[PDB]
Design a protein around this ligand. Sequence first.
Ligand SMILES: *[C@@H]1O[C@H](CO)[C@@H](O[C@@H]2O[C@H](CO)[C@@H](O)[C@H](O)[C@H]2NC(C)=O)[C@H](O)[C@H]1NC(C)=O
Ligand SMILES: *[C@@H]1O[C@H](CO)[C@@H](O[C@@H]2O[C@H](CO)[C@@H](O)[C@H](O)[C@H]2NC(C)=O)[C@H](O)[C@H]1NC(C)=O
Lengths: 107, 97, 215, 215, 225, 225
Amino acid sequence: GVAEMNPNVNVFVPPRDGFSGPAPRKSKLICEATNFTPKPITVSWLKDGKLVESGFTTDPVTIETPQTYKVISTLTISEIDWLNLNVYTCRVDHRGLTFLKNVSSTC
Amino acid sequence: EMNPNVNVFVPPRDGFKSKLICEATNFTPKPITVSWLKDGKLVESGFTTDPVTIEQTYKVISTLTISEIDWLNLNVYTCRVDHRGLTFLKNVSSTCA
Amino acid sequence: EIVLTQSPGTLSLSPGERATLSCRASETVSNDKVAWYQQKPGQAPRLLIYGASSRATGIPDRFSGSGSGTDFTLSISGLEPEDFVVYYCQQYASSPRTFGQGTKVEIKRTVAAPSVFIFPPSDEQLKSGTASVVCLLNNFYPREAKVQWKVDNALQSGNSQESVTEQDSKDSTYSLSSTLTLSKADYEKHKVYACEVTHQGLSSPVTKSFNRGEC
Amino acid sequence: EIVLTQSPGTLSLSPGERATLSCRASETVSNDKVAWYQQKPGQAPRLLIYGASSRATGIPDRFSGSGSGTDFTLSISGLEPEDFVVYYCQQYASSPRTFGQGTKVEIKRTVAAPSVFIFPPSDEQLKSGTASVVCLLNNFYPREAKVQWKVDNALQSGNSQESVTEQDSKDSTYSLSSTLTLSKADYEKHKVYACEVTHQGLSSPVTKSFNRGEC
Amino acid sequence: VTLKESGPTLVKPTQTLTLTCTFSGFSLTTTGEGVGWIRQPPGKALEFLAFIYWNDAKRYNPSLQSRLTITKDASKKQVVLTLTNLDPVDTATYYCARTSGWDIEFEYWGQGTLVTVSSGSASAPTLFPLVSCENSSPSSTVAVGCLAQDFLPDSITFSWKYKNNSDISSTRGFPSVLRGGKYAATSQVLLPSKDVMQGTDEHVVCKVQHPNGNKEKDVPLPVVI
Amino acid sequence: VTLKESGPTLVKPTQTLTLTCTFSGFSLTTTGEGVGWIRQPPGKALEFLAFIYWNDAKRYNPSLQSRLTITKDASKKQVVLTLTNLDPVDTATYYCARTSGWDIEFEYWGQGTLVTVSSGSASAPTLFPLVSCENSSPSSTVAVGCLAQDFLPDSITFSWKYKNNSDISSTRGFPSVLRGGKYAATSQVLLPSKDVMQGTDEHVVCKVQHPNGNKEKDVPLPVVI
Ligand SMILES: *[C@@H]1O[C@H](CO)[C@@H](O[C@@H]2O[C@H](CO)[C@@H](O)[C@H](O)[C@H]2NC(C)=O)[C@H](O)[C@H]1NC(C)=O
Ligand SMILES: *[C@@H]1O[C@H](CO)[C@@H](O[C@@H]2O[C@H](CO)[C@@H](O)[C@H](O)[C@H]2NC(C)=O)[C@H](O)[C@H]1NC(C)=O
């Protein structure tokens, strides 16, 4: 068949005018990680403690001296759930370590 | 021939140099040009273009390298998309501003 | 003293063609007392035709043996897949008997692209005071190949062996093992270790180099 | 009346091997008055050997002609790349003279996968009252292939032609054209039009279907 | 020693066919010299028709007995071949050769002429566009064809050109096929998909040449992308 | 008619070598019957040593004259072959056959035994890890080897197993090579790049069997992912 690092969780949220389409409007959530090796990360979405099993598309991990990689994910959400102040957490499992990142729309 | 859906993402309110993604999914044909602006001025360097994937539709995304100081000062980053001669603009700003 | 030489040393055949084997003798043979033998790499040899005139018991009629004097051609019709072995010709009219070199046959397969993987020695082997670097090749054809070591722009010879396996039953390929042995003092002075492979199917030699203690 | 049959009708050869051509005759020939001719697809025929005994002027010595009675074998050594044409044997001792069938040779090339592209008829052709559906295949080997039409789970026969090109100089392949002709009234009643291809290199037939006026 | 054939190329069935085997460089005064006729249909082998020896001695094929006439001439150095009761299925390219000796037969062949036996007249070729429907898997390349129908004789060479007056390597070309008396030709080209989805050319022209009318018609490119 | 060979397998050079060609099913009372000795080095062809006829008449090879002795016996139905002045370069597998008639020679062969002539004793096989270094182009598949050195004789069959007590198709196996008196062997295995990056195994074992000691050592597997 010697570089061991930790992933950096980066969660993207839509702006105040990022919703479009017929009512109810829908948006997307992106959780990316860069500068980490190896790549045992499994994409998992948690909505207020509830595991999401539908509406997500896990794209294949691409390729960006250690060899780094990047993974891009997409989760379909709704505008109604965004107005109820629901915290979305991007679960990251890297070599057994659990990485969490709580985001919301509170100013 | 369909109009691409321009969507620009913003960093979270509670902090995160972040990145800007301008998705243009559900577009045809495959060729598409995506650029970036900064307060109405052309951007020379500081951004890349990911290869177009396959979702018949495709998927094209762009990454812009910005800073936290230059993002919370009422700066508009319009994602100019030229598709079949049609220029698509999307002006975004701070949600809490 | 009769010297028997079988030329060529190797030949590529096909499953269902004619394979001609030659048996050159230094001098003549009385009453054409030349016999052929079949030996399998892993089993015991067997006698096919005695005296090059009549066949023995248990030998199919597809084996034909003719020739007299200093020429003996062993023609075989319908080469079965289980007959790709090394054959020999032996005479018993010399007082005493003598043997030859032998001819090795194989299946004519298209030339592929081998992938050479060099394994640097581990740290546990260096503690004993000896080091060895291997140069393994897989899926190459034919058996004829050249393996050379180029360390610090210098060619090493007289201290490297070349051992090759047999033909695969399901792949019809070969695999050689070239181990470069050296001492502990001769391993801590050089920097780059690699082996050069020259293959018919490759338009340019491929070298796999590494760094000392940086991989 | 002497009937000459040349079997087989086709044979695959190699650039530098021996090509044997047979010439079977219904009866015997007086004084072995059988001659061979060489014809190129696009030029005029020429006489190589007259009487199957002596060669003519301007013919290389690599062409050998032997045989007598009802057997005539045309052996050629060193088949040049510019000799892949159709040869014929003709006798002139029958009062009058008769010809045969001929044997077509080709270059032994590996089997590939053809790429079938079916082109539905345009709207301008339908205005004249006639419709035609083509079934074009390229880069396939050998020439032997089966083309069948399956429209509405029905096999159409007796109204489709099969025309194939010659051997390519740089590709050594062939290209056949299968046009399915029909009337305007017979084209507005069916829905799916496709042609089935059965190739040796393909383990499953590939069908390219479309929709009437929806592509 | 050379020979040349000439005569009409478009004749009607069941009428009169005449061909001349013009030769120059020898005379029919020695022995063992004769001129024959050999034809080959486009898809069949050589066929024997008749042969004439010297000293006013000619033979005929029993299969075509009492159907062909041989008229030699020592003044014009040519032989007139009259063919009556024509048949469209007998369309073949006739040839004539010269024999030098008993052993040598048909050594110096001629050139030959193409004679088409059909009831139709000379009409300009009609070109029809061929829309390419390559859905699902476009594979590697997408091809476009230019249909050719209602042309006589088969003397059309295809030539593909770009929209900006360029040259396209056609190479692949199918021969003609008898379609109820007339001929039908089809020719395509393997155009890469990279130059189609990127270029602004929406169609290509199909320019062909024919001695009975230079017809041309561009074909649309639906593309796949 | 069957034959069987037996004797020591580990002997020292320049001492005494004795082999017995045990046979049962026939007797040396007729004419044209004899037993010979044929050896073959691992990489060379067959070599003739000696042959003995009946009625107390034996011959010797002029190349090895005055170096071999033949002692037959009609009571034990076996022939004792004494080999003096051994040489490590003469290591070969000896065979013996029986001849039935003048024309038929060496028809019923035996089994044969492997005799190694070396000054070293029987030592346990020393296994060493072989860490792979494949940089730049990952290619498609990467193999891992298990070094085997200082073993005698060559009776080691390699076997690869996973961390969870499974089976790995080794298939590929290289023969041993003489290394200054001892033997050295190396065995690799083609592991797919998909299974390695999926499992969580950090090392694999190299289990081998030898009649002079069952040694094993795991090699590091830094994985790719
Ligand atoms: C006509 O337009 C075509 C575009 O379809 C041109 O083809 C391009 O130019 C290069 C060089 O001539 C060609 O080899 C390629 O097929 C095309 N380029 C790419 C990047 O696809 C063609 O050159 C034009 N003709 C002329 C005379 O300029
Ligand atoms: C031991 O672990 C290995 C992991 O390296 C297992 O191999 C995987 O499981 C399947 C089913 O047995 C194998 O066919 C594949 O090679 C591996 N899967 C993938 C997706 O790579 C192996 O199964 C385990 N052994 C047992 C007995 O469960």
